[PDB]
Amino acid sequence: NPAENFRVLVKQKKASFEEASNQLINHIEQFLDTNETPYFMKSIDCIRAFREEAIKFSEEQRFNNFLKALQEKVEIKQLNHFWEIVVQDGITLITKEEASGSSVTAEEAKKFLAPK
């Protein structure tokens, strides 16, 4: 339900809306004491919605650095439930693509998940 809330919030006043970013950050992170897979897939769906929202107009790099921050914050925490679920469900499109340039080299650097 809140996914639609911050989906329509960004397109109703045309602001940066750090409140929506904080809400989705709170939603995605809270999985240490909860093992509910439905919660995790709802969280990845809403963060993907915010990914495409950021892709839309001018804040691609904003969600790029947010995704990197999410990556190190899930990497520092060593738990049996980690970003593997994001990777297995992010197989379609999670890599950034702005224009001819760093997008392709990011594709090679991320597709294999490690430099080979």
PDB file of C-alpha atoms in Angstrom:
ATOM      1  CA  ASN A   1       0.000   0.000   0.000  1.00  0.00           C
ATOM      2  CA  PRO A   2       2.679   2.627   0.857  1.00  0.00           C
ATOM      3  CA  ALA A   3       4.346   1.806  -2.471  1.00  0.00           C
ATOM      4  CA  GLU A   4       1.531   3.630  -4.256  1.00  0.00           C
ATOM      5  CA  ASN A   5       1.763   6.378  -1.624  1.00  0.00           C
ATOM      6  CA  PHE A   6       5.337   7.329  -2.464  1.00  0.00           C
ATOM      7  CA  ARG A   7       4.763   6.472  -6.132  1.00  0.00           C
ATOM      8  CA  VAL A   8       2.096   9.170  -6.424  1.00  0.00           C
ATOM      9  CA  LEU A   9       3.848  11.488  -3.951  1.00  0.00           C
ATOM     10  CA  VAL A  10       6.789  12.117  -6.287  1.00  0.00           C
ATOM     11  CA  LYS A  11       4.505  12.892  -9.258  1.00  0.00           C
ATOM     12  CA  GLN A  12       2.070  15.124  -7.338  1.00  0.00           C
ATOM     13  CA  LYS A  13       4.265  18.039  -6.175  1.00  0.00           C
ATOM     14  CA  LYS A  14       7.508  17.711  -8.215  1.00  0.00           C
ATOM     15  CA  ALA A  15      10.013  17.846  -5.359  1.00  0.00           C
ATOM     16  CA  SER A  16      13.105  15.911  -4.331  1.00  0.00           C
ATOM     17  CA  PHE A  17      10.986  14.056  -1.739  1.00  0.00           C
ATOM     18  CA  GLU A  18      13.639  12.751   0.627  1.00  0.00           C
ATOM     19  CA  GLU A  19      10.721  11.491   2.735  1.00  0.00           C
ATOM     20  CA  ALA A  20       9.909   8.816   0.144  1.00  0.00           C
ATOM     21  CA  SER A  21      13.581   7.832  -0.031  1.00  0.00           C
ATOM     22  CA  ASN A  22      13.714   7.508   3.758  1.00  0.00           C
ATOM     23  CA  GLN A  23      10.495   5.467   3.779  1.00  0.00           C
ATOM     24  CA  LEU A  24      11.807   3.017   1.190  1.00  0.00           C
ATOM     25  CA  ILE A  25      15.173   2.850   2.974  1.00  0.00           C
ATOM     26  CA  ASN A  26      13.369   1.935   6.197  1.00  0.00           C
ATOM     27  CA  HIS A  27      11.237  -0.642   4.381  1.00  0.00           C
ATOM     28  CA  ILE A  28      14.097  -2.369   2.555  1.00  0.00           C
ATOM     29  CA  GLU A  29      16.452  -2.646   5.532  1.00  0.00           C
ATOM     30  CA  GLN A  30      14.195  -4.258   8.154  1.00  0.00           C
ATOM     31  CA  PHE A  31      14.831  -7.947   7.547  1.00  0.00           C
ATOM     32  CA  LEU A  32      17.182  -8.969  10.391  1.00  0.00           C
ATOM     33  CA  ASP A  33      14.450 -10.205  12.753  1.00  0.00           C
ATOM     34  CA  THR A  34      11.905 -10.993  10.011  1.00  0.00           C
ATOM     35  CA  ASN A  35      12.495 -13.858   7.573  1.00  0.00           C
ATOM     36  CA  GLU A  36       9.299 -13.232   5.577  1.00  0.00           C
ATOM     37  CA  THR A  37      10.109 -13.656   1.892  1.00  0.00           C
ATOM     38  CA  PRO A  38       6.907 -11.763   0.874  1.00  0.00           C
ATOM     39  CA  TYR A  39       8.217  -8.736   2.764  1.00  0.00           C
ATOM     40  CA  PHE A  40      11.517  -9.001   0.899  1.00  0.00           C
ATOM     41  CA  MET A  41       9.895  -9.255  -2.529  1.00  0.00           C
ATOM     42  CA  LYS A  42       7.569  -6.343  -1.750  1.00  0.00           C
ATOM     43  CA  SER A  43      10.614  -4.319  -0.683  1.00  0.00           C
ATOM     44  CA  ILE A  44      12.554  -5.155  -3.840  1.00  0.00           C
ATOM     45  CA  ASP A  45       9.488  -4.318  -5.945  1.00  0.00           C
ATOM     46  CA  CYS A  46       9.105  -0.896  -4.328  1.00  0.00           C
ATOM     47  CA  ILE A  47      12.820  -0.112  -4.569  1.00  0.00           C
ATOM     48  CA  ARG A  48      12.686  -1.099  -8.256  1.00  0.00           C
ATOM     49  CA  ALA A  49       9.740   1.271  -8.673  1.00  0.00           C
ATOM     50  CA  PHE A  50      11.840   4.031  -7.125  1.00  0.00           C
ATOM     51  CA  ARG A  51      14.702   2.935  -9.408  1.00  0.00           C
ATOM     52  CA  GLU A  52      12.591   3.596 -12.490  1.00  0.00           C
ATOM     53  CA  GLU A  53      11.294   6.817 -10.909  1.00  0.00           C
ATOM     54  CA  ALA A  54      14.896   7.982 -10.525  1.00  0.00           C
ATOM     55  CA  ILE A  55      15.668   6.838 -14.074  1.00  0.00           C
ATOM     56  CA  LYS A  56      12.768   8.914 -15.413  1.00  0.00           C
ATOM     57  CA  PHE A  57      13.876  12.525 -15.283  1.00  0.00           C
ATOM     58  CA  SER A  58      17.288  13.517 -13.887  1.00  0.00           C
ATOM     59  CA  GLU A  59      18.155  11.584 -10.694  1.00  0.00           C
ATOM     60  CA  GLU A  60      19.669   8.406 -12.151  1.00  0.00           C
ATOM     61  CA  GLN A  61      22.941   9.042 -10.311  1.00  0.00           C
ATOM     62  CA  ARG A  62      20.967   9.616  -7.107  1.00  0.00           C
ATOM     63  CA  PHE A  63      19.623   6.072  -7.122  1.00  0.00           C
ATOM     64  CA  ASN A  64      22.981   4.829  -8.418  1.00  0.00           C
ATOM     65  CA  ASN A  65      24.748   6.044  -5.286  1.00  0.00           C
ATOM     66  CA  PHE A  66      21.778   4.891  -3.189  1.00  0.00           C
ATOM     67  CA  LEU A  67      22.146   1.399  -4.678  1.00  0.00           C
ATOM     68  CA  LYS A  68      25.881   1.440  -3.971  1.00  0.00           C
ATOM     69  CA  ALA A  69      25.186   2.530  -0.383  1.00  0.00           C
ATOM     70  CA  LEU A  70      22.649  -0.280  -0.021  1.00  0.00           C
ATOM     71  CA  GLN A  71      25.299  -2.645  -1.370  1.00  0.00           C
ATOM     72  CA  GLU A  72      27.975  -1.750   1.173  1.00  0.00           C
ATOM     73  CA  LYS A  73      25.440  -1.607   4.012  1.00  0.00           C
ATOM     74  CA  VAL A  74      24.259  -5.139   3.203  1.00  0.00           C
ATOM     75  CA  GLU A  75      27.855  -6.312   2.663  1.00  0.00           C
ATOM     76  CA  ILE A  76      29.116  -5.076   6.045  1.00  0.00           C
ATOM     77  CA  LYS A  77      26.360  -7.010   7.830  1.00  0.00           C
ATOM     78  CA  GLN A  78      27.317 -10.690   7.651  1.00  0.00           C
ATOM     79  CA  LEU A  79      24.083 -12.686   7.883  1.00  0.00           C
ATOM     80  CA  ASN A  80      22.666 -15.836   6.305  1.00  0.00           C
ATOM     81  CA  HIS A  81      20.094 -13.689   4.450  1.00  0.00           C
ATOM     82  CA  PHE A  82      21.943 -11.228   2.211  1.00  0.00           C
ATOM     83  CA  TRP A  83      21.770  -9.499  -1.190  1.00  0.00           C
ATOM     84  CA  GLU A  84      21.661 -12.886  -2.938  1.00  0.00           C
ATOM     85  CA  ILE A  85      17.868 -12.568  -3.121  1.00  0.00           C
ATOM     86  CA  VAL A  86      18.242  -9.155  -4.765  1.00  0.00           C
ATOM     87  CA  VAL A  87      20.753 -10.591  -7.244  1.00  0.00           C
ATOM     88  CA  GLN A  88      18.577 -13.583  -8.157  1.00  0.00           C
ATOM     89  CA  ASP A  89      15.530 -11.334  -8.635  1.00  0.00           C
ATOM     90  CA  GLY A  90      17.540  -8.457 -10.119  1.00  0.00           C
ATOM     91  CA  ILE A  91      18.652 -10.602 -13.043  1.00  0.00           C
ATOM     92  CA  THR A  92      16.525  -8.562 -15.457  1.00  0.00           C
ATOM     93  CA  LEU A  93      17.759  -4.959 -15.112  1.00  0.00           C
ATOM     94  CA  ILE A  94      19.485  -3.455 -12.072  1.00  0.00           C
ATOM     95  CA  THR A  95      22.556  -2.066 -13.829  1.00  0.00           C
ATOM     96  CA  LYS A  96      22.534   1.641 -14.640  1.00  0.00           C
ATOM     97  CA  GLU A  97      22.269   2.897 -18.220  1.00  0.00           C
ATOM     98  CA  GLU A  98      22.445   6.630 -18.956  1.00  0.00           C
ATOM     99  CA  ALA A  99      23.981   6.921 -22.437  1.00  0.00           C
ATOM    100  CA  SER A 100      26.865   5.642 -24.538  1.00  0.00           C
ATOM    101  CA  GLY A 101      29.690   5.583 -22.016  1.00  0.00           C
ATOM    102  CA  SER A 102      30.114   4.155 -18.521  1.00  0.00           C
ATOM    103  CA  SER A 103      26.874   2.178 -18.925  1.00  0.00           C
ATOM    104  CA  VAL A 104      28.436  -0.544 -21.083  1.00  0.00           C
ATOM    105  CA  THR A 105      31.557  -0.968 -18.939  1.00  0.00           C
ATOM    106  CA  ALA A 106      29.242  -1.144 -15.930  1.00  0.00           C
ATOM    107  CA  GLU A 107      27.412  -3.904 -17.810  1.00  0.00           C
ATOM    108  CA  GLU A 108      30.584  -5.976 -18.126  1.00  0.00           C
ATOM    109  CA  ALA A 109      31.693  -5.143 -14.569  1.00  0.00           C
ATOM    110  CA  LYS A 110      28.342  -6.158 -13.036  1.00  0.00           C
ATOM    111  CA  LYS A 111      26.980  -8.933 -15.282  1.00  0.00           C
ATOM    112  CA  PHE A 112      29.602 -11.439 -14.106  1.00  0.00           C
ATOM    113  CA  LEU A 113      29.253 -10.080 -10.518  1.00  0.00           C
ATOM    114  CA  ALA A 114      33.088 -10.026 -10.315  1.00  0.00           C
ATOM    115  CA  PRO A 115      35.992  -8.965 -12.571  1.00  0.00           C
ATOM    116  CA  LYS A 116      37.106 -11.950 -14.655  1.00  0.00           C
TER     117      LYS A 116
END
